[PDB]
Amino acid sequence: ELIVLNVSGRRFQTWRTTLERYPDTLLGSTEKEFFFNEDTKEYFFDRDPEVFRCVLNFYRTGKLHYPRYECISAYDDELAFYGILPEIIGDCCYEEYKDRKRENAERLMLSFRQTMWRAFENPHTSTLALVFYYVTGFFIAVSVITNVVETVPCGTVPGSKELPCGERYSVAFFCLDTACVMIFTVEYLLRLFAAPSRYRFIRSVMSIIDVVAIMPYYIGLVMTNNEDVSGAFVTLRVFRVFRIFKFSRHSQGLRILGYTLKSCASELGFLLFSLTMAIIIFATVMFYAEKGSSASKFTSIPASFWYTIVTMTTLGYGDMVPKTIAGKIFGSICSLSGVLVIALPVPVIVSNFSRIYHQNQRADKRRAQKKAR
Amino acid sequence: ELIVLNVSGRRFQTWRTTLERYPDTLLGSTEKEFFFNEDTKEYFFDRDPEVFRCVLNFYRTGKLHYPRYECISAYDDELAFYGILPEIIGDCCYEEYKDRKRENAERLMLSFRQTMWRAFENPHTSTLALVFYYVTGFFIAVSVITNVVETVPCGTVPGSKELPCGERYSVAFFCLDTACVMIFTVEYLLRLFAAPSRYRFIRSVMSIIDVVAIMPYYIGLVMTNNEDVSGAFVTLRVFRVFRIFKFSRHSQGLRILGYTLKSCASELGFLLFSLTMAIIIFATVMFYAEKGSSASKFTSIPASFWYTIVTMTTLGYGDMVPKTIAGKIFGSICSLSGVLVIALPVPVIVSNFSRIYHQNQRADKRRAQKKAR
Amino acid sequence: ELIVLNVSGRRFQTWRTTLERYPDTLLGSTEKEFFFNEDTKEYFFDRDPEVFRCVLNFYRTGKLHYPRYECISAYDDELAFYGILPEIIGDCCYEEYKDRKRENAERLMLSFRQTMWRAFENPHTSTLALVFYYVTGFFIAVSVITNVVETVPCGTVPGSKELPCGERYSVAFFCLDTACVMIFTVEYLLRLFAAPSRYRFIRSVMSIIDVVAIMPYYIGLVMTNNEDVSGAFVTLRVFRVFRIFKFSRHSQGLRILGYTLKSCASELGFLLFSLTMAIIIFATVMFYAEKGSSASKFTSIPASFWYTIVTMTTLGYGDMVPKTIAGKIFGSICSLSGVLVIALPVPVIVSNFSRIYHQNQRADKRRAQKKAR
Amino acid sequence: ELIVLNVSGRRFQTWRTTLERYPDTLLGSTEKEFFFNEDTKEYFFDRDPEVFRCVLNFYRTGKLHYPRYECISAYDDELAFYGILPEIIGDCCYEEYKDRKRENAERLMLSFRQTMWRAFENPHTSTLALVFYYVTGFFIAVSVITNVVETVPCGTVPGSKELPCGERYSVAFFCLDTACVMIFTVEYLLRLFAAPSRYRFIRSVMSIIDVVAIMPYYIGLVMTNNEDVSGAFVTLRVFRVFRIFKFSRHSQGLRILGYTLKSCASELGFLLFSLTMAIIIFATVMFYAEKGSSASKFTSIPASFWYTIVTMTTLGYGDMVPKTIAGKIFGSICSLSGVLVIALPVPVIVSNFSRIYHQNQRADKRRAQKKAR
C-alpha cells in the first residue's frame, strides 16, 4: 500500500516494501505507530518537512546524502530523532560533514591559594592583580635594558683606558641585576606555591623559561672569578637574554606565535631538510666551479656553505662572489632556487598565524557577548 | 487539534500545544485570529512559504536557525512581521547572521560661507573649484621641487668655491619660497573661515599637516642668522618636507593608505614589539660571538643593532659581516627569522588596503548608479 | 477572494487586492486570463514552482529578492516570462546579481587577400602558415643573438689592439643584419597589404613595434659615418633591442602580460606616485642626517635618491651606507617602508595575471568542447 | 489533459503536449506507464521530489539547469534514473558541473619475488622492511657526509704542506666510498630483480637517479690516474652529489615537490623565457649606458648579464654597480621589473605544493578511516 507521510503537512508517499528496508530505526520499525493516527492512516509527524527528504532518499537509494545550506545543528537533531547515525553517511558527501561539525564545535567551544592562582592568570579581574602584573613586567624591561647597556663603551676617562660601562660601574650594575633577579625568583616562588598541579607547572614551558632566566645569576655566584676561564662565562651572559621571553605573559602575540610554530612542526622540519640538501648541492657545485682561482675563498665545501646560504636568501653581502663563468651561472640558479624553496613554509605559517589570531579575537568577542546575555 | 497553516498555500500542520509554547509573538498569541477565516479553520497567511519553516522549527526545537541562501533582508522583514527578535537566534547559526547584516549595512551605506565649504571638498562640482584645486596643487609641486633643487651643487664659478644653488641664488629661491608659503597660508585661512565646525577643523589631521608645513617659514624669520646655531635650523629645512603631504587632498590613494594604516594599529604595534625583541636577541648573540676579532665592528650590542636590522630585512650592505663560525651560523639563522617576523603584517596590510580601495570603488559606482535611477 | 495559483502543481494563494498592486505585468494585469481555466478557477501555470515564490514575495513586499543557488539563466528566463524587469530588483540583493550576469556573459562569451589574412593570425590552421610563422620567428632569434654577440670582445689578434667582434668582422655582421631586416620589412609589408582595416593596423601596437624595430637600420644608412657624432648612434643600437618584442606574436604569455599591465594602469600610476614621494621624503631625511661626514657621498638630495631607491628595494649594494646614528635609524625605517609600499601592487598584478591566464585556458577549452559537440 | 505527477507526494502538473517534447527518455516515452496506477491517473513516482523540478523545467525550456547545493551524487543517480544524459546539460550551468564531478572523483579516488616487491614500496608493513629502509637510508647520509668532509683542509702536518683530508687519508676514505657504493648497487639489484615490470623500472626516474649516483664510482676505476687529465674527473666528484637525491624514497616532501614541479612545466617555461628576454633588454641598456667609464666592468653585454641577474633578484652583491645617471635610472627600473617578473610563478607554485600536500594528507586520512570501517 502507498503509505503516505504528511510530515508537518508536507505529503510524501512510498511503498512499505522499501520503507521496511532497514527497520532498525524509527520509521522502518513499528514504534512509529505511536504517531500513527489512523483517523488519516498517515503517520502525521511534527518534524521539519525538509530533513525527511534525505530520510526517504536513504530508504530509496540505500544511503543518505547531506545538503549544504541548512544549519548542521538541526540536521544532527533530526537525524538523531529518527535514530539514524552520522556514521552511515555515504562518502558521496562526508568530508564537508566533518568540516561543518569541526567548525561548529570550535564556535560553541580558595581562601589564600586559589586567590593567588586566579589573580596570576587573569590580571584584569582584580586590581592588585594589575599592580603585580605591571610591576613584574616593568622589572623585565629594566633587566633587558641594563643587560643591553652594560656593554656600551662609555666614558673616555683620560686617566685610564677605554672601558665598557658594565665593568666600570661594577657594583652599580650588580645591584640592578640582583634586584631584578630577586624579584624574579620571588614571583616565581609565588607562581609555584599557588600552582594547584605543582607537577604540571614544573613541566610547563613558562617555568622552564623562568628557571633558565634565573639560574645564570646564581651559577655566576658559584663560579666566582677565582675559579673560572673567561670563555666559559660568556655563555652565562648570553643566556641572560632569555629573560626577555618572560614578556610571553604580558604579550598575546608571542603566545599565539608559539602556538602557530608548534602547530606547523612538520612543514618546518621539511623546510630545514630541504634547505640543508639544497645548501649541500649548491655548495658542492660552487666549490668545484670556484675551486681554482686567484684568492678563491671557496677553500672548502663547508666554506661554501656561507656563500650558498647568503645567496639563497637574497641577502648578498658580497664578500664571497664567484669569478668564473660556471660559478656565475650556478650562483644565478642558486638565488632562484633558494627563493623557491624558502617560499614554501611562509604561506601556511602566516595563514595559521592570522587564523589563530582572529580565532582568539572572535572567541573572546563571542564569550563577552554570551556573558552579556 | 491538528491546527493547519496554509501559509500562502503551503500547508504545514502542528498541535496547538506546541504552538502555545511561546505566546509572546504573533502566532503563539491570539491576535493571529484576525487572519483566521474559519471558513477553512486554518490561519491563511499571505507571507512567504519558506520563512515560516524556521518559525515552526523554532516552535518545535525551542530555537530558530538561519539558512544561508535567501536574502537576509526578506528574512529580517518576515521575522519582524511575526514579532520575533534576532537576539533569540540560537548560536547554532549566529555569527554569519551578524556577518550578513554587517555587509548589508555597508552595501546600503549658504550665501558665501557654505558656497566655499562645498567648493573646497568637492572640486569637480563647480568649475571655479577646479581652478582653485589645480592651482593650489601646482604650487605644492613647485615648493617640493624647489626644496629638492636648492641643495644641488651647480655652478663651477671658477672665481669662488663650489656652492649649492640654494645659497648662490639666495633671493631667487627666497621669493619662490615666500610665494608658495603665502598661497599656502591664504588658502588655509580660507579653509578656516569657511569651516562650519571650526573646532573640528583645527583638531583634524589635515589642519595639523598644513600648519606644520607652514610654520617652518615664519619660525625661520624670527630666528634670523643673527641669533642662531647652524645645528638648530637643519630641523627647519627637514620639516619643510612635510608640505609634500598636502597631496593628500589631491590623491585618493594616500588617504586610503592612511585609513588602512590607522585601521591596523594593533598588528603594527605587535610588529614593532616583536621586531624590537628579535633585534635585541640576535644582537646579543652576534655581539658575544663576534666580540673578539681582528677589527670586529661589533664593538657593542647597540653597534650590533645595525648588523641585525640590515640582515633581518635581507638588505645585506656588507659593511658588517661575521667572521667566526658562530657568527656565521647565527647570521644565517637571523636572516630567516627576520624574513619570518616581517612577513606577518604584510598580508593583512595589503589585504585591508585592497579591500578599502575596492570598497570605495564599488561605493561610488553604486552611488552614481542610484543617482542615475 | 483568495485567488489560488497552482503553478505547475505548487499551490500558492493570495488576495487579488495585493495581486493588483502592480498590474503592469503578466499576473497583475488581465492577460493571464488566457491560462485561467475556470474548470478550477485557478490560474494553472506550467512554469517553475520555485521562481514564482519571488514573484508573489514582490507582490507582498513591493520588491523582489534574488536567491543564490539556482542558475541565473532560468531566473532571467522566468522573470522575462512574467514581464518583470531586472532593473526593479531591490538593492537588498543587487550587486551579486550583476556579478552573476557578468561572469555568465564571460562564460558564454578571399581569393588571395583573406587567405593571407587568415594564415597570419592563425598559424596552426594551414601548414604554409607554420612554415611562415616558424621561419619568421627564427630570424628574430638570429637578429637578437647577433646583436648581443657583436659586442663580445673576442680575438686577441696580437698584431693589433683588442677589438669587439662587431667591428672586426664588419661586413660579416652587416650581412646578417641586412638579411634579418629585409625579411622583417617584407613580412611587415605582407602584414600591411593583407590587412582589411589598413588604418586599424597602422594604429595597432604591433605595427608600431615592427616599424620601430626596423627603422634603426635605414636611419643608420642615411646617417653614414661621414656626417655623425658617435654619441647619437648609440641610441640606434639601443633601439635595435626592440626587435626582441616581436616574440609577442609567438608567445602567449607576453600578450597576456601586456593585457594585465594595461588592465592595472591605476594601481601602477599610484605605485609610481607613492614611490616618488617616499623617495623624496627619505632622501631629504638621509641627506640632512648624513650631510656632514668624512667622505659623505650624500652630496645632494638627488645624490641621495640612489641610496633611497637601493634601500627601499632591499637591494643593498653597499656603496652608499650611512655612518651616523640618525642615518642608521632612518635607513632602517626606509627599508621597511619600501618593503611596505612596494608590496601593494604585486598582489593585484599577479592575481590579474593568473586570472587572465586561466580565463584564456578555460576559454579555449570550452571552445574546443563546443566545436566538438 | 493536465497530467499530474505526484512524485513521492509532491504534486506537479503539466500538459502532455510539452511532456511529449522529447519522448526518448523515461517520462517522455510510454514505458513510464508501468508506474501509472490509474487508480489515481497520476504517475506516482517514488523518487526525490526536488530533482524532478529540473526535469520538468527541461521539458518546459528545452534545457535543464544544475542547482548548486545538493550532492551531485544523487543528482547523477536521479538523472540516470530518468535516462537523461549529463551531456545535454545546457551551458547555462556546465563548468561547475564538471568541477564537482572532478573533485568528487578525487574524493572517491609471491613466494619470494612479490614478498620483496611489497616490502620495498611499503616499509611500515613488515619489520624487516624497516630494518632495510633505515639501514639503506643511513648509508646515504654516510656517503653524503664523507663526500662533504673529504674536502675540508684539516691537519697542519708541519713536516709537509697543507692537505685536505680526502687526499691525506686516501684509503680510509676509499673504503667508506666503496662500502656505501657496494650497498647501493646491491640494493639496486634487489630493486631490479624484484620489479615485476622490469622495463617500467629502468624507464623510471628513481632508477636513473640510482644508476647516475652509482656509475661515478666504477667510471672512476676505469679512468685510473694513469690515463686522465685532472679537469675531466672534477665532473665525477660533482656527479657524486646526486646520491643525495636517493632521499626521495625516505622523504615525502621531495616527491611532492617533484610532482608539483612537473605539474607546473608551462609556467616554469614561461618564467625562463620572460626572464631571459628581460635580462637581454636590461643588459643591453645597462651596457650602452655604462660602456664608457673609468674601470667600467660592463665590458660586454654578456658581462652585463651578471649585473642584471644580480639586480633583478634583489641580491645586490655590489661588485658591479652603475656610475652614470642613466645607469642608475635603469638599474633602479631593473630591480622593480625583476621583482615583478619573478613574482609570477611563485604564487601558483606554492599553491600547487600546498594543495598536493594537503590532498595526500586528507587522502591517507580518508583511506585509514575507510579501512577502519
Describe this structure as you would to a colleague.
The PDB classes it as membrane protein. Keywords: Potassium voltage-gated channel, membrane protein. The assembly is tetrameric. CryoEM structure of human Kv4.3. The structure is a homotetramer of 373-residue chains. Chain A is mainly alpha-helical. Chain A has helices at residues 16-19, 52-61, 72-81, 95-107, 113-121, 128-149, 165-168, 170-193, 198-202, 205-222, 234-239, 252-262, 265-289, 301-312, 325-342, 345-372; strands at residues 2-7, 10-15. Chain A has a two-stranded antiparallel ribbon with strand order 1-2. In chain A, a hairpin with a 2-residue loop joins strand 1 (2-7) and strand 2 (10-15). In chain A, helix 8 runs antiparallel to helix 10 (205-222) and helix 12 crosses helix 16 (345-372). Chain A starts with a strand and ends with a helix. In chain A, 28% of the residues are buried. Chains in contact: A-B, A-C, A-D, B-C, B-D, C-D.
Under CATH at level 1, the class of the largest domain in chain A stands as Mainly Alpha
Share of helix among residues of chain A?
55-70%
Overall number of domains of chain A: 3
State the distance separating the first and last CA atoms of chain A: 52 Å
* Helix and strand composition category of chain A: mainly alpha
Major β-sheet of chain A, in short?
A: 2 strands, antiparallel
Backbone shape of chain A: flat
Give a count of the beta strands of chain A, DSSP E runs of length 2 or more.
Answer: 2
What oligomeric arrangement do these chains adopt? homotetramer
CATH topology of the largest domain in chain A: Four Helix Bundle (Hemerythrin (Met), subunit A)
The largest chain-to-chain contact, stated as pair and per-chain residue counts, equals: A-D, 58 and 56 residues
